Every structure is written in C-alpha cells, then in structure tokens.
C-alpha cells in the first residue's frame, strides 16, 4: 500500500531504508522461430560482492565469464542444458536486471556493461567503466537495467572451444563496484532473454578437459569442452597445485599428476567436497577423483581445490563435469 | 472427505552470507509435504496419525518478517515436485525452479504451489521412492545476510483431504543409539522430531537438538557409569519440574521442554555434561501441551 | 516408379528381393502443452541382430533395458539431454517403427512388443513373445509397426534412481527374434513418439556412479545417477573386473579399485579406447581413468573393458559419464 | 560474382558390419564444405586454388549404388552446420541431426542442404576455428552390411558463388616427413590429396594411399641406403613408365598414377619395399590427367 | 561532420561543511567545455586530439549518487556560457546562475545546457581569450555535509561535431620544474592531466597528483643525489611493476598507475621520498590502457 510520507510537500522525492522487489518463478515460454525453437526466460546470474577498489565481475579475472553464449552456464545455469542439443543460437531480446538487497545506507557503485567484443580485457579504472556505450549505473541500494539490443547473426554454441571466442559470443556482460563497505551483497543481478536455436544435434557433452605439460612451462594448457576453467585458473608452481573452479554449481573432478609425490587434498576456498574423495598414491603418478560444491566466487589466496607438498610435477591431466552432487563418491 | 484447513508455523530463516538451504539442514526430504513430516506440519501431524492418505486442494508457503529493515540479503521460498530430489547448492540453481519465489527479509513473501487430484499415503517412513508418497518438498534458502537474529518465520496454509482413519500412529518418537559402537548412526522411530545428527554424543557430552517448534515431553534413559548435569542453554526452557535418577551404570532424565525449534550450533536443545564410559542412549520424544508438566 | 510384374495376372501378390524406405532427418517440432512443452520427435534405436534361438534385446539381459523415460538414453539418444531439464513427463503419442535392411531371403522372425510393466522379465520362449497384449511380429525382411496406445497419468523422469521403476516408466520396449541366419542385421528400430514435459529444474546430471563393496559380495551394488549400467553389468570374481556399458555412445570413466594389486586394462569386446588411457596403481589401491566409444551390443564374454589378474579385490567405485569424443585424454 | 555449377564423385562407400563413418578415416573435417577441400571437391578445386571467397547457393549430396539387391544395411548421408564437431560413433546419433538421409544399398538416395547468404574464406589451411570457413562438413556412415565390393558412389552438386581472382593456391601438394625422428607426422603443404596417417612408414616398407578419385602426378625422394622394388597392388594403377633413379643414400621415383580413391588396408596405392635405413620422405602430388604421363 | 555521441565520467564529488567548488581546485577554466579539456571529457580528448574544431548540439551533465540516504548537505551542479568568469565562492552566487541545478548527494541529478550553433576551435592551450574557444565552463558545488567517502559521481552526456582531420594532437603530458630556481611554477606541455599545484616538490618529498580517472604511463626523470622509495598511498594504485633506475645525480622511475581521480590533500597518486638536492623534475604522463603495463 502507499502511504503519505510525513513533512514533504506535493512532488518530493524520499529516500527509504530500503528498496525491494518480489522475484518469483516463471516457467519458459516457447516460441514460433525461423530455427527450431524460441525461449524466452529468464535466469539468475550472481550477486555483486561490495568492494572499496574498483573490481569487476567479483574479482574474477578470466575475461569473457558472462560471455553471451547459451553454453555458457556462468551466465546461464539453465539455458545451458538446452545448448547441449542444438547447434546454432540467437538471442532476440536481452536485458540484465539489478535488484538491490541493501539499504539505502549502503555507499558505492554499481555499473552493469555490455561489451560487444567477448574477448576485451577487463576495465579497472572509473573512466573505463563509465565508457561503455552499453552501460547502467546506479547507487547499490537503487534497482538498475540494462537493455542489449541484438543483432540478426546466428552464431555457433562454441562446443569445440573457438579460439577466437568474439565470433561466436554475442559480446560480454559484465558488472564492476567501488566505494563499497562490510560483507554483505550489494544486490542481485538477473539475465532476461530470448533466444533462438538453430540445428537439432547430439549432445555436445557436459565435461571439460584440462591438459598441462609442466615439464614444458608452469603456464598454458589444452583444454577442450565445456568451459568451466581457464588457463590462470590451474596453478602448478611451488610445490603446490591448486585449481579454481570460479563458475558455481556442483562438480565431478578427475585430476591425474605426473609427479613423484603428493601430499594432502585441501578444500580451503570456495568449495567443499561432497562425500568422500577417492585418493590414489604412487612413486611417479597420483590420481584423485571427488565431486565438489562450489560457490564460484573467485578466492585470491585459496583455491576451489589444492594439493600439497609436490614433487617434481611433470604433467597435469583433469576431467571437470557439472553434475548432481547425488553421484558423489560413498566413505 | 475429511476436509481440514489451517495455517502453521514451520520454522525462522537464520541469517547467512553463503547461500544457506533449510537452515544448513543437509537432508533431502526435510519439508517433504506429507501430512506426517512433523518437521512441516508441526500442527497437522496430530491429526495426521490417525488416517491413511491425504490429498491437498490448497497449498500454499508464507514468510514473515521478524527482523529490521536495515537487514540486508534475500530470503528464498521454493517448492520442488520430487520430494527425492536434491537440495540446490548456489542460488542461480533455485531460479530454475518453476515455483519459488524471493524476497528481502524485511518483507513479507508467499509462494502457491497448484495441487494435483491425486491420493497418496500418510505414512512415508517405510517408503524407499518417496516422490510416489509425498506432495514434492518445500525448501527455503538464504544469502547476503547477516546477523544471529533470525529475519522471519515460514508458514504452510493448506487445505487438505484426508481419506481413513486408522489405528493411530502415535505422536511419540523413539531414539537409539548403541554408542559403544559408534557415536553416530542410531534407531529412529515414531514421528521425526529429531534426526540422526540431532543427537550428538562425544567428548563426555550429551546434546540433543530438537529444531522443530513447539512443547516436548522426554524421557532419556543413559547406559553410563555417571552423569553429571542437565543444562537448557540452546533453542529451549524447562518448563516446570526435571526429574533426575542417577545410578551406577545408568542414568534417567524426565521433562517437559518448550523449543524455539530454532537450530544452534553451539548449544544444543538439552545437553548432559561430564557423561563417563557412555555405551547407550535410549530416549522418548512427544509433542505435547505445557500443561502436563512435572511439578516441583 | 510402378513396374509390371511378368507372369502375374491382376491382383497377384509379389515378393522382391528386398523392400526398403528412405528415412530422412526431421527436426523436432514445439507444441502446444498442459505442461512446459510437447516435442513431437523421432529417433533412432537399434539394429535387430540374427539369432537362431530366440533371444531378446540384441541378448541384453537387463530387465527394462528400453524402458520408456526419456531419461533412458537407451531409448532416446537426444531426449535424454532434454529429460535432464524438467521434472515430469508424459507420453501422448508412442509408436515403434521396423525397417528391413535385409533381402527377402532371410529367415526367422522378427516381434516389436510393449509391456506396460517395465520391470518385468524378459521372455524367452516362443509362446511368451506371442502372447503380449501389444504386440507385431514380420519377416525380417517385411516392414512392422507397433502403435502403443499412450494414457495421460504423470510420471518422473527418474533421475533419483527409483527402485519400484515400473511406477516411473511408462512400461518398456522389447524386440525379439529366432530362426535367423548370418553376421549382418535383419532391420532397423525407430521409436516416434509426442512427449510432454511438466516442470523446469536444474539439470538432473549426466553421471552415474557405481559402488560395490565387493568384500562383502561379489554381487549388489549402490548405483546412483543416471542408469547406464545395471549390477550385472559389473563383473567382479576370480581375479578379473569386468564392466559392460551395453548401452551405445562415448563414456567418460574412472574407476577406483581397492585391491592389492591389478594387472592389464584391456579392451577387448563392444568399446574402443579414445585417446590415452590414465593408469595409478599403488599397493593397495589402482585408479583408471579413460573415455571409450561403446557400440552398445552386448558381448558374454569379453566385457566392454575389463582389468585382469586383480589381487584381493575389495572393493569398486566407479564413475560413468556420457561425453565426446573430444574430451578424451592425450597421450 | 563468377557462378559454378556442377557435379561430381566424391568416395565409393564400402561395406561394414559394425558402423563405418567415413569409410573408417577419423578426421574431423574430411569432408568440410569448402571448395579447397578436394576430399570433397575432387572438381572444383582446380577452380577454387584461383579465387578468395566462395558462396553456395543450392547444394546436395547423391548416393548411386553400384552394388546388388542382395546386399544388406544401409547407407547414411549426413551434413552438420558445425565443420569441427566430433564424427558420430553410434548409429542412433546420426539420427539427431537435422540433415541426413538413410537408405539401402542398392537404393538411389539424396540429401539437400539449405545454404545461406553467407561469404567465406577458400583457404582454409591456416584457419584454427574452421566451422566459420566452412559451410559444416559433409559425413557419410554404413552398419549392417558385408563385403569388399563397395556398396555405392557419393557425389555432390552444387551452385556455387566464388568472389575474388587471387594469385593461384596450385594443384600440388607437398609431404615431408623426418622418419629418423619418427615414422609417424609430417609437414603437408598446398591440396590435401593425403593426410599424415595415408603415409606408412615402416618395417623397411613405404606405402602412401591416395583415397581421393583421380589421376595423379608423383615424385618420391628418398633418404634411404637402398630401396627395393616399387608396386601397385592397391587402389592406383600406373599410367604410362615409371621413372626410376637409386643411389647409394638417396632414392628418387616419378610417375603418374591412377587411383580408385577407395581405402584399402593391406595394400597402399603405391609401395616401395625393402627400405634400409629411412631417414627421410619428400614428396609431391599433382592432380592432373592421363596426357602427361611418361613415355617408355 | 564527423558526429560522436558519448557519455563519461568526469569526478566524484567530496563533502564539505563549507561550499567547495570543483573540490577545492581553485583554477577558472578547470571544466571548460572544450573536448581537449581532458579534465571534464576524459573519453572524448582522444578523438579531440586528431581534429581541429567542434560544436556541442546536445550536452547535459549527470550527477549519480555513491553515497547513502544518510548523507547531509546538498551537490550543485552548474554551467557558466563565459569559461573565464570566476569561481562562485558562496552558495547564493551559485543561485544567481541561469543554468544550474542542485540537490541532495542522495539523489540523482540532471542538468541540460542548450547548444549554439557556433564552431569553435579544439586547441584552446595557446588561446588567451578562452571563452572564445570554450563553450563555458561546467562547475560543481557542495556543501553542508561531512564524510571522507563520495557524495556520488558526475558525468557529461553529449552530441558533438568535429571538423578537420589534423596531425594528432597526442595524448601525452609533458610536466618540468626547474626546482633549484622554484618549488612551484612549472612548465607544462601536452594534454592538461596535471597543472602546477599537482606536483609538490618540498622537504625532500615529489608527490604528483593525477585527479583525472583513468590509467596512465608515467616517466619521472629526477635531477638529485639520491632517492628513497617510490609510494602508492593515495588515490592511485601501481599497474604491474615499477621500473627504477637510481644513480648519483640522476634518477628515472616509469610505470603504469591507476588513479581513482579523487584529490588527495595527504597523499599524492604516487610520492617518491628522501629525496636530496632535488635540481629539477621533468615527467611524461600518458592515457592509456593498463595492457602495456610493464612486467616482472
Ligand atoms: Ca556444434
Ligand atoms: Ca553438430
Ligand atoms: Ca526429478
Ligand atoms: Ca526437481
């Protein structure tokens, strides 16, 4: 209900505590299309952590995470499920919607972009994120929109890993905050689409693969299928391995060293095994496998999963798969 | 054909950063929506006991605010068709069901969920497929908050059909665990006031948490060579006498408890401290009225 | 074109030396729904295999092998990854279509049949496969056709491993065949059908996990996920492991053994290695991973892959997931 | 701009029990619909090696058996959008695709892709992300049959848009292979006639399998002791004389040869037997015709 | 001719008891509307530099705010059409304005200048008349508030016209002070990132302050004795690593730094410390992308 608001005049404007708005479920609607199929849905994506220096996409540094893919599951949890089955896409309609869930107390900023090129380098400086010609910005305690209007151009779910990402994304969202404070959320950020598939097809695979010659360098990889990590995610330096699952949900790991010896399995960052972990030792080879949890915000200090305390690493081979933490291993 | 409509509290939403489903509450059925989860219908479970199956006409899940408007975060709402199904891990997973609904803790929220024409069985507990005897399960989550203070309560308002009575099922619930062999893992029957890791039982403690709303009778019977006290310091009050009998080699406790039925992890509903060479814990647990407890 | 047939006088019935009809690919329709959407689609199933006794499901001796849940991709090879989005289903048109591949010089029997009780035994004799209510028996060499007349109850996707499927399962697909001759197959199966779907969730996982404490047994087993083996499938006595994936497709595996010590990995029946295979073996414990390409058919001799001489066997934990190819490991 | 029509021969399908994609060849792009591809384009190559860009405007692929009634199976044919998606391995998943068509053997059968407004590059062979140089990739599969007699012909036609006069790309293709590092990978430059693994080499043999339809020009130089005798027992017959020149340390050999295209396992299309001591393969094939063979 | 329409963000607001305008910065043309004023146009002044003239034909300017609801005071926003008039020194000046607009720090804020039709000329750096070569000045104001965290942001939203392609201008800053004649005064060439007061060079201290957004290059060479340390404790923050050359009489230090544009009164955007017999400061400082920053 409306109410007056004591001590203003005709035409003021007030501040509240706080400002909010219901979120309820919608199932998909489903669309004549030129393609097989339109979807018109809508997802949420992740919740803009405060911080006092500008960081964008909360501190995750891999360029092109909420790139605009429908295999993209960092940008669409649901929609990518249904991008395993089609070859082609287009998006038709694209918003993103913030919704704070702070009080009108809170201080900073909060810019939600689009960038039409998916493999741009992310902004750090406050003039860089103001210059984005598809921009919204607004205090953490103010809903915020921000429309992108497409374009007519199929493109191909990238399900053999594009090397040239921009061709086949439709750019890049991406969110930055400064002169934030405390530990709490500024507020929620929502993708509203719709979206077009093109080429019925076999199920492009859920698992990502992840190869690392260390003997050859500490840095660079090959990794094929579904893209849950990148390259800077994977550390092998030091004695230590450490990886970086910066996407939530829940995942199926098979990690395989070529090294001497190993020492302890860690979850000390954001994800925590499910179940138990299979561990096995040997004089040259390790090999552990285990489903986590993660909460896919990136950690700087603390990777999704370490191990310890190893000798002479040669090769690191991994198989990372979405799943249901109902499939995880038994004590 | 009976026909029963009310409202009920389920339980408070604690405040959590990371996302939090259920209050933390690990177990997949924890609200199933069947008239028997005591854990949802904390009023309905006494009628309940006393017919075969049930059908829902009217269903729906409320949030009321007990917090401040200064309290940041969201409060979920969510129902999931499969009562098996797991619990979602992070939030862009709750938005993929087609019921649920989201708000701020300061507001209040309500999520209907459509109900089917179909029958099925009030009691679940011996049932392995559960989906084919319960309305799906309610679940609440969650996040960007702070604070010990919780930031509302859940409620279910429903109107239900019930089908036959029966011999009652009985509001009392029993526990066991034969501790000697492990400190985990027990014996639960009757109604499911407490789970498994309710009852924690290590270090020469005792500590039983019963994180369902409401007044208790209960009886702990302790295999132990001593004891020594029973402290209320958690989500629960004596409510008049405690009957104690300390012997050599075992121990019984009696009392009727009121539970905020609000979980903590710190102290437990009751506990029993100082507890040497535990090798068995025996217990009764009854929903019932203030009125009967023991008197001084 | 019609041709005359020399030496027929009018209304005479002919036999070729062989029928056949062009299939083409069809891209699935969207309809109207009660539910999230009705796809009206057609797929694949497999090649009736030449026996001369009569056996059943190209000799897989799994109960419900076809069941029909489009989460079985036994049945459906694309609708399983459209199961894994929603809760419900229900089939609303359901017909099973045969196809010779072979001339009309074959002999034996071909029968397409449905039983409405997944969970029910497999037939073997020559009455049984006769007397099912929904029933069509042909020549290998003639075309068949068995319309199941579909209801309009709900059921899930079973995707938490249902014990009682026959409650989940809108009943099971069989095919059997006797008096035949010959390496090559009779004719194709072809399942076509109209589906609903009820309620959207997050995907239900593409992962099935195995466990059997083979210490206690050297049969049973937990097994959660989607259900691309059964128990017997699982083959644990006298120093061997073998496990047969009887269902088509790419595999990823790892699978953890608890023995004191293991011998070869081999490869020796229905699947083929991809890529390189990733082997640890410790006192105590081995651990494998790999992903293979299974034609499905089932071997009785030579499992899909087996691991010989193991020592002490105590127990296997295992992990299955359908993939690509492309995920494979690298040498 | 310059407006191509035509058809042509692209493979012979062999007979296979168990699924065959491709006549067994593993490659991902075998067939890529790019005018450059000759495995494709056995024609229009020739044509392509001069332009920059091309557009299809109406294109199909033909099945014509040449085998009997009595043969058994079937013939999938098989077009994806995506040039660098994995072949399929099971017959249920050629059956997802959008465009394919199946039939038997000895059935006359055709598949009509739907081409777009689109321009793309003719070279290929530099470009990592192919799919967006290529109009998908042609595939063709058969299961259910037996036999070394091959079941039926593929063929393509096609209207074909090209764009730009270049400086020739040439009809040669170069292979270099450094054996006394290792008997497997190479260099190949210019036209993809053959790819690493058609180059065996060897327990002192060298077998090269041209399986792309045609009349070749080729130049062997070898880095070897001594050779042996050089044969065609395969797919290829000589035309016209074989030049032959051996030496102590080095070999040499040109010739015009015949092939058949069709795959087979046990002999090459050419062979030089009795190789000792291999150090190095360099070689070039040339597309051409009949009338420039040598002279004995 | 050549029309560009853009919006960018000029400088956060800081509170004040007192009325501050253009937070403390006490120069008359600070935000003259010029697009080689890279002071209010921090985007545009890249295009700005390879053209000769332009003429503004939409331009507004926006105030968002940062800060919270509890905030006291009031932010001003405000537009002079003469780009040499002085700085309002009390808030009823401010008033007197014709284009102007004021409101809390809490509220968004909007202020629309209506264009002319003139064309003037983009390098007003020799011009003495600069209102003939400025279409005004923009300023802002606060007062009656309290805080070190900003009030909020402001920004110019425009449609502008260049004219003639010319040898560009470049985005380089040129900064030198002969110390050893003066601790203040200073030659400055280039684009205006910096003016005078910026550079302090006083007890053995060099703070230079970049309060323009962005990410920058700098070169400092130093004509002293010795050096100490190189410090980022102010609005500023290092972009991958400093490189440092120090020698008797001589010192250069160039990295890559990005300043949060908000002033400072105690720390500069970077200091260099102990430093002895300072003669003379000459200095580079260029706009640019933090992808040339240099390595470890
Ligand atoms: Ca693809
Ligand atoms: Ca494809
Ligand atoms: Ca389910
Ligand atoms: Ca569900």
Known sequence: NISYTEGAKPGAISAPVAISRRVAGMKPRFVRSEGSVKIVHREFIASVLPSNDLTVNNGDVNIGKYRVNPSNNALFTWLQGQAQLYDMYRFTRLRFTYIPTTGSTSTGRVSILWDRDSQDPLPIDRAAISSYAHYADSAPWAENVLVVPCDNTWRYMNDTNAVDRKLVDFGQFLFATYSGAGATAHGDLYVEYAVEFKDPQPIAGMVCMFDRLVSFSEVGSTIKGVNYIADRDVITTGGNIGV????????????????????????????????????????????????????????????????????????????????????????
């Open 244 to 331: 970086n699952i910066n996407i939530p949900g829940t995942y199926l790991v098979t990690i395989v060293l070529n090294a001497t010896s190993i020492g302890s399995l860690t979850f000390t960052g954001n994800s925590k095994l499910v179940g138990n972990s299979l561990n096995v030792t040997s004089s040259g080879a390790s090999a552990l496998t285990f489903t986590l949890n993660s909460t896919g915000v990136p950690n700087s200090s603390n990777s999704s999963f370490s191990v310890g305390t190893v000798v002479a690493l040669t090769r690191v081979r991994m198989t990372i798969t979405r799943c249901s933490p109902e499939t995880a291993y038994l004590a």
